[PDB]
Design an enzyme around this catalytic site. Structure first.
Site, PDB file in Angstrom:
ATOM      1  N   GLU A   1      -0.712  -8.491   2.212  1.00 14.27           N
ATOM      2  CA  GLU A   1      -1.044  -6.322   1.798  1.00 14.27           C
ATOM      3  C   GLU A   1       0.133  -6.381   3.068  1.00 14.27           C
ATOM      4  OE1 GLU A   1      -3.741  -3.538   3.914  1.00 14.27           O
ATOM      5  OE2 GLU A   1      -3.159  -2.427   2.294  1.00 14.27           O
TER       6      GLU A   1
ATOM      7  N   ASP B   1       1.780   2.464   3.463  1.00  6.52           N
ATOM      8  CA  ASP B   1       1.482   3.831   3.298  1.00  6.52           C
ATOM      9  C   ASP B   1       1.298   4.891   4.327  1.00  6.52           C
ATOM     10  OD1 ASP B   1      -0.457   5.364   1.581  1.00  6.52           O
ATOM     11  OD2 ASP B   1      -1.924   5.198   3.431  1.00  6.52           O
TER      12      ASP B   1
ATOM     13  N   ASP C   1      -9.027  -3.226   7.195  1.00  6.09           N
ATOM     14  CA  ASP C   1      -9.062  -1.830   6.543  1.00  6.09           C
ATOM     15  C   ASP C   1      -8.995  -1.849   4.825  1.00  6.09           C
ATOM     16  OD1 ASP C   1      -7.844   0.569   6.463  1.00  6.09           O
ATOM     17  OD2 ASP C   1      -6.186  -0.164   5.870  1.00  6.09           O
TER      18      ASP C   1
ATOM     19  N   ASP D   1       0.584  -1.064   0.151  1.00  3.54           N
ATOM     20  CA  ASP D   1       0.294  -0.034   0.026  1.00  3.54           C
ATOM     21  C   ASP D   1       1.034   1.308  -0.182  1.00  3.54           C
ATOM     22  OD1 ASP D   1      -1.507   2.218   0.838  1.00  3.54           O
ATOM     23  OD2 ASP D   1      -3.788  -0.020   0.821  1.00  3.54           O
TER      24      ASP D   1
ATOM     25  N   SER E   1      -6.899   3.455  -1.409  1.00  2.00           N
ATOM     26  CA  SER E   1      -6.848   2.372  -1.084  1.00  2.00           C
ATOM     27  C   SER E   1      -7.936   1.942  -1.329  1.00  2.00           C
ATOM     28  CB  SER E   1      -6.774   2.388  -0.214  1.00  2.00           C
ATOM     29  OG  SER E   1      -4.926   2.760   0.875  1.00  2.00           O
TER      30      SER E   1
ATOM     31  N   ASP F   1      -1.371  -0.437  -4.797  1.00  2.00           N
ATOM     32  CA  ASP F   1      -2.903   0.559  -5.160  1.00  2.00           C
ATOM     33  C   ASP F   1      -2.183   2.094  -5.225  1.00  2.00           C
ATOM     34  OD1 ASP F   1      -1.405   1.201  -2.231  1.00  2.00           O
ATOM     35  OD2 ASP F   1      -3.560   1.371  -1.817  1.00  2.00           O
TER      36      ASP F   1
HETATM   37 ZN   LIG Z   1      -3.606   2.651  -0.342  1.00  2.00          ZN
HETATM   38 ZN   LIG Z   2      -4.143  -0.901   2.549  1.00  2.00          ZN
HETATM   39 ZN   LIG Z   3      -2.834   6.632   2.556  1.00  2.00          ZN
END
Ligand SMILES: [Zn+2]
Ligand SMILES: [Zn+2]
Ligand SMILES: [Zn+2]
Ligand SMILES: [Zn+2]
Ligand SMILES: [Zn+2]
Ligand SMILES: [Zn+2]
Lengths: 346, 346
Positions: B225, B230, B106, B14, B55, B272
């Site tokens: 993930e 992120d 999430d 992410d 996301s 992503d």
């Molecule tokens: Zn993301």
């Molecule tokens: Zn994520």
């Molecule tokens: Zn973010």
């Protein structure tokens, strides 16, 4: 077993990381020519002594196949001159050309025809052109050939070496088709920016190089540089950067249209390094009581540095041998991969 | 005519753009597992309504194969539910799992098992887990099951739908082998950061999923993930970002080690979107009467935004069918490419 290209076109976008490349997908009219590529690789760009490379060591990695020190032009880390792809091509009876939107003496083109201990020695680099095997060049830098400390007229020397030199404008192919070698020096220093009306110079000059060097069905090698993308980055000037990389993507289209028709041409597109930390960030708005907030609906490009950065850089390849260029590798392996697929020897 | 993978592992980092990926080449001991990949593509990440994706829509592009609005979880632009790759896998007798270092509710994991109008509905997402087809999961988010605003005990509902649940620690495979479905809820909210001692959770949980889901010679699909890359980006915290992507690269090695031994497994690694405008800039060196100057010898990471950015994102693929993932395409084609190579019934 991959195929064997007869011709190679290497297009270098100076200073364009993947974020810069991505700007063409948002700020260019119509689909970017990058989308024509299937075979994609990544290069690590550090020099022999520095995590963050400059243009001189970065291009010398491509042109000569070695890691060397920042500021080196066509020399190894111990400063010994090394044979470039242009010299090797000449030994294999391949015609060669270099095109740039900077001065033709700037680090990127210089690494393909000169050997100097430091990229700043541009009057020495211009003189190096006279002992090179290059058959075609186009870019700026007229001052380095005619307004020199040593007061020499390097154009006369080039002309004695079979160059026709044009300092006026890019011409039609019919104006140069019968020349033995051709050089265009179209600005005193760098060519104008796109914003100042450079127009289609890079694509046109690349087309001219292709037609000229493939006269009589000779195999050719060309390096064409979108030189000023890097400058937009250093200045943290988004419109400058964007307009220069859109122009570069036009040149990619020119090269690919030729290659797809020709069927025996490998086109490689890459960069020497990234610059400016260019980022396609969300648009920023201000309130009145605690200003800044983001709007993800739109892009507001941002920068984080005035210099280069060490991100891996994408490589795109199309044509015979293009599969050799996938995976992740050091920047200097670009040289070795080109020799491998072309079978150009030493 | 490509080979057909029996199994698929999709690893999502992410918020990792190519600059984040590149940090593993400078700030990790040894060589990154990224270097094992040859087949590389690029995805465009914009949502149906916004140039810069979040996301939820970014993950829904992968799990469901449509462009949708920022905040959407497994629903189309018009808010209606869309069939996901997990739901397709289940209908094809494929065992399914999801692993994350965030809460399991999430946006990224949720997009693979839930259908919600807005990613903020995390208690609804937890309830969706109880009705999903997932056979395995591991991550944080115990609060959304046992400390809800509505006071419902969703843990009991999970167990009443055949999930064996462990809220203490990850176990070995023999411990869980005879269970029909397995869920690990190992933190109240997010798992600990690497800097706070998370250790090899992501690799260990992915390895456990692989073993559990391949029971009785079954084919499997796993999404794992690296969720917190992120968060390092949002915080503009280099050491956080770097330690999290180094951990993600370990997970890649785990997946690839399995795929190479197995020979019937496709491993896809992508992100992503990018966040923070993370840049491997030159280290800043100080004097005094000149203050700041750049030293290209070393790197000093910089950031330019607190939010996501719209750069294209690298895709890496290894194993049967991996050649399908090269070139440049929209993020939602990841779904369609997975469906294509597996030959699953839609
Ligand atoms: Zn993301
Ligand atoms: Zn994520
Ligand atoms: Zn973010
Ligand atoms: Zn450069
Ligand atoms: Zn340059
Ligand atoms: Zn520069």
């Amino acid at each position: 077993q991959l195929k064997t290209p007869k011709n190679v076109i290497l297009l270098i976008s100076d200073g364009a990381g993947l974020s810069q490349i991505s700007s063409t997908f948002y700020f260019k009219s119509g689909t970017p020519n990058y989308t024509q590529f299937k075979n994609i690789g990544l290069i690590k760009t550090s020099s022999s002594r520095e995590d963050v490379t400059d243009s001189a060591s970065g291009a010398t990695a491509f042109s000569c196949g070695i890691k060397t020190y920042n500021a080196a032009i066509g020399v190894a880390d111990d400063s010994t001159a090394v044979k470039s792809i242009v010299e090797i091509a000449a030994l294999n009876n391949i015609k060669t050309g270099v095109v740039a939107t900077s001065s033709i003496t700037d680090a990127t083109p210089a690494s393909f025809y000169a050997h100097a201990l430091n990229r700043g020695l541009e009057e020495e680099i211009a003189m190096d052109m006279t002992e090179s095997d290059l058959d075609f060049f186009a870019g700026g830098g007229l001052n380095y050939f005619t307004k020199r400390k040593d007061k020499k007229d390097v154009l006369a020397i080039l002309k004695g070496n079979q160059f026709t030199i044009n300092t006026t404008a890019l011409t039609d192919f019919s104006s140069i088709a019968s020349n033995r070698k051709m050089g265009f020096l179209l600005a005193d220093e760098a060519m104008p920016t796109m914003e100042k009306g450079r127009g289609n110079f890079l694509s046109a000059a690349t087309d001219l190089a292709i037609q000229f060097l493939s006269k009589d069905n000779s195999a050719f090698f060309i390096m064409s540089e979108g030189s000023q993308i890097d400058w937009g980055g250093h200045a943290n000037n988004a419109s400058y950067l964007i307009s220069e990389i859109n122009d570069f993507d036009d040149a990619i289209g020119t090269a690919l249209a030729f290659a797809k028709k020709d069927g025996n041409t490998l086109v490689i597109v890459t960069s020497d390094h990234e610059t400016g930390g260019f980022t396609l960030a969300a648009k920023k708005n201000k309130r009145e009581d605690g200003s800044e907030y983001s709007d993800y609906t739109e892009i507001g490009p941002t920068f984080s540095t005035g210099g280069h950065s060490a991100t891996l850089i994408p490589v795109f390849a199309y044509g015979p041998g293009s599969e050799e260029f996938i995976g992740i590798y050091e920047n200097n392996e670009i040289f070795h991969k080109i020799l491998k697929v072309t079978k150009w020897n030493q």
